[PDB]
Rev protein (Borrelia burgdorferi), 138 residues
Amino acid sequence: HHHYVEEKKEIDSLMEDVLALVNDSSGGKFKDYKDKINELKENLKDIGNAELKEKLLNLQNSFQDKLAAKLAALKAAKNTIENITDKDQDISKRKIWSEAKLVGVTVPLLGSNTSGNGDKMSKNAVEQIDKVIKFLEE
């Protein structure tokens, strides 16, 4: 019985990293794990070890579930930020900041009274969230 121990360790290590993905993990971390998953699937394609194939399937399934959660969290934060009404209120500005922060997007809190600081924070947050969504859906 050939065991593919080193290949199974490769899958396990990547699985543990994928399971640590959260909704504020950077988009680059998602694409990096996706690329490593694809390269493993390609390099292990000819191995019929049932346990190894199941481990690879579990690894892809877990990644897709982490990706679905990240993309839903991004679109949710985007929708919320867009729908804030009195965006220049102190409370609205902190809300834009915190909603972006929850999905791994850093916007400056423009706390001064300069007219339009809220709509400007909103615009920045949505533009960054859109780039992450676009990056992840490539």
Notes: The chain has five helices and no strands. The longest helix spans residues 50-83.
